[PDB]
RNA sequence: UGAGGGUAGCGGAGAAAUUCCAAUCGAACCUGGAGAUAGCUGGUUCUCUCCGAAAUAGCUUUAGGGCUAGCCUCAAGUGAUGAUUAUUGGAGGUAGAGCACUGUUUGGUCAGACAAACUCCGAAUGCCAAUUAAUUUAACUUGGGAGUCAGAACAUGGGUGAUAAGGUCCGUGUUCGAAAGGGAAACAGCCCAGACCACCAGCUAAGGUCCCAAAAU
RNA sequence: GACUGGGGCGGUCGCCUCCUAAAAGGUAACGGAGGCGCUCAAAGGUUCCCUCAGAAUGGUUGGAAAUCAUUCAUAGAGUGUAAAGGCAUAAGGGAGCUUGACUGCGAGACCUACAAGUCGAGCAGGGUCGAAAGACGGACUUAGUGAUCCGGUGGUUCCGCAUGGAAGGGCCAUCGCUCAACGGAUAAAAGCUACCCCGGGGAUAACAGGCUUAUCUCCCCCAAGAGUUCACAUCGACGGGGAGGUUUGGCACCUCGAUGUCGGCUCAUCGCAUCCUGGGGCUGUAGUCGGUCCCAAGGGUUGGGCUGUUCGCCCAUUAAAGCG
RNA sequence: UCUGGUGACUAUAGCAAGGAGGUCACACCUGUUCCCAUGCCGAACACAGAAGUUAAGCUCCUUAGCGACGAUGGUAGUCAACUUACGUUCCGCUAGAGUAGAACGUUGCCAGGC
């Protein structure tokens, strides 16, 4: 199964992106790190 | 009986947008294609989906460059 | 019965009958030719008929070569029926001749046993043809 | 079978046929809502002057209807940006031809052949340009008003059909549509040619010169 | 529901690539031939290096195509998934670090009725690989999708009906569709009419006219052979060429404010491709009878049973029981 | 000119058989003490370098067998015109593909040492 998630950053509670995962490819939660609207910096992301 | 046949795409308008020897403006379209039927040159970029264009504006030329290649560059003075 | 293996396509576009010859002008293995002159098709039928009766009248005593082959398939829709709604089954093969391609050639017979061998074979043709000898 | 009576329209009566209910009954008649509604038919009345189309694209509970775009018209505004050849440059793979590739194919690596979805090659024209010269007179912009969306033959490139139809579906050109006149015996589409009105003058086109019937037995 | 070589029945409806498409773009048919409604956390970004298919020879013979080395190769493999254009600049084949599968934008142009769709140098904010110049806002390229209204979820420096709060609305970010008849009538929909009724159309069918001649009816050329030998007395294989316009059809031009449809009675009339009679030519014609083919339309061409019959089959005749 | 670097005109430069040459250089070649290297291997990419040789590479020269290039002349098509219905003809432009002759064993730029 291929089912969207939305991101997440941690520092502040904010969704800010959207993507694709394959449930079976990959059970666990994504945590990729990219640029952030708030801060002006890069923190992390996370469903 | 039936036919299993119709069915086909409309159009993509795919050719020579300028011509040889007129002055274009800087970011006008020079060439639509699929692939890279003929080359970007000099001042000219290759654009994603491979439309190449025009950069600085200026005359245009369609130039030959090696067996069955061709190129198309664009210089400034007009 | 004179058709190919396989083919590309089974339903094609009908051939061009105007002009004259491509190529194949010139008797090149045997002595004694048949060229054509005039254009029509020829469906591969019409040359079992005119290859046996050039085989009957040699007694055997030399070769055939028939230098044609229907390529081409042409259709046609059963009796009775309304226009449209599709394009219709395979019937036959045809091969396309143009005013100067030799059609059969002979050697290894005399010529006046060759030249009244090839008359039984126009009759079964429907082009006029005429009896062309080997460029010398 | 006479006489007097009863059942009434979303209703009566029916030994049952959609049968009868004031010459009409798959749901009577009469005035009212009501000048119901109609993308469908017929009709629409005075005269001259100038310009003069379309029968195509896209979407539609759409296919004989509608809306925007295309073609005509009147007025304002920019003002050679419109057309035509001559020279010049360049994009592109048709006709033709050829098997180097993908498949087809006849006779002993050699000789020969075939191709809408094959190309080592490849015209004639067309198309886009220069801001270059020569002849001509259009062209874009903003606003007012409609029409048209059933097209037809002939010529010439091809599809479908049977190298069938005055067949049907697309590309380019002309005439009819909206065009009289001379010719084709008669005949919207073929060939010559575009009528401002008058004349009992003249020279010619397509086609014609014995006679009907103008002109050479 | 609509298209529909009348309607029904079957089929098909949107997006992608090729061909017909007539060497720029564009271009139709119930014309020819295939896919799509997704998949990848590495199959994406960057940096550094490598080049393929098969052929042939050899040996645990795993046919030399399991694996193994040498030559030859010019692109004949491969590129997530159809086909076209394209590339060993690699856009193909392996490794390390990695999140640009970024936030705010966008001069210009292609394309187009409108709504949309597509390419975009460059400027700032933060980053990544590389020593650096530099490259990167998804994948070799194009398909993998759906207006509005309405509701749900997280944010908000916006309003909040006397004033202070709130219930509610606003913008930014995302979610609910085989609305697939894919520009989507509504949150919600199948039939019968020969009991039928109004508005239209020869724009569109059934009968007849017309064009065409695949079918249908006759006619002919070549000649293998059947006929003791013998192609042509007679028959005419495999193949080729036409005429007629009676059959079954194809096209939808004339008539839907009427062209109203089969056979036999009554009465005709014309064609020659002749059933009878008249005149000949061959004959495998002894004689009687026949068979074929050519000239010939002047007259003639029966009476009944069975069927609504068209064909037809039978019974008794006759010089003959002609086809249109 | 003559050698090496380095871009251009880009098979008229190529591919293949022969033949000649080497302190000026490029190579061939020996090595693993280390940075560096194999998903197997100093073969390769690095790195150290008295010595060893023109054999292959590159460099020069000639032979045109193969690939590429290619006229003139004629034909096929075809824009325009005139009759025409014929698998058409005649006239005026343009001009192919194949084939013959032939050109052909590269023409040059700029810095560095002879
Ligand atoms: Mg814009
Ligand atoms: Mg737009």
């Excluded at chain 1, 992106?17 to 790190?33: A, Q, S």
């Excluded at chain 3, 290894?108 to 009896?131: C, D, I, N, Q, Y």
Aim: include cysteine; charge should be positive.
């Amino acid at each position: 199964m291929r089912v969207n998630v939305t991101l997440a950053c941690t520092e502040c509670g904010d969704r800010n992106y959207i993507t694709t995962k394959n449930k079976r490819n990959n059970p666990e939660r994504v945590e990729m790190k990219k640029f952030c609207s708030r801060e002006n910096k890069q923190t992390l992301h996370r469903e | 009986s039936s036919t299993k046949n119709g069915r086909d795409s409309e159009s993509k308008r795919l050719g020579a947008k300028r011509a040889d020897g007129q002055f274009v403006t800087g970011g006008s379209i020079l060439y639509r294609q699929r692939g890279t039927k003929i080359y970007p040159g000099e001042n000219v970029g290759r654009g994603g989906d491979d439309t190449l264009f025009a950069k600085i504006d200026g005359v245009v030329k369609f130039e030959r460059k090696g067996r069955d290649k061709k190129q198309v560059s664009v210089y400034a003075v007009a | 019965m004179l058709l190919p293996k396989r083919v590309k396509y089974r339903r094609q576009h009908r051939p061009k009958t105007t002009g004259r010859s491509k190529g194949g002008n010139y008797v090149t293995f045997g002595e004694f030719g048949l060229q054509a002159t005039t254009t029509s098709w020829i469906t591969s039928r019409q040359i079992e008929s005119a290859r046996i009766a050039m085989t009957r009248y040699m007694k055997r005593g030399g070769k055939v070569w028939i230098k044609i082959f229907p390529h081409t398939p042409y259709t046609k829709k059963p009796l009775e029926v309304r226009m449209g709604a599709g394009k219709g089954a395979v019937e036959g093969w045809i091969a396309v001749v143009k005013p100067g391609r030799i059609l059969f050639e002979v050697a290894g017979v005399s010529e006046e046993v060759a030249r009244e061998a090839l008359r039984l074979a126009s009759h079964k043709l429907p082009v006029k043809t005429k009896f062309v000898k080997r460029e010398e």
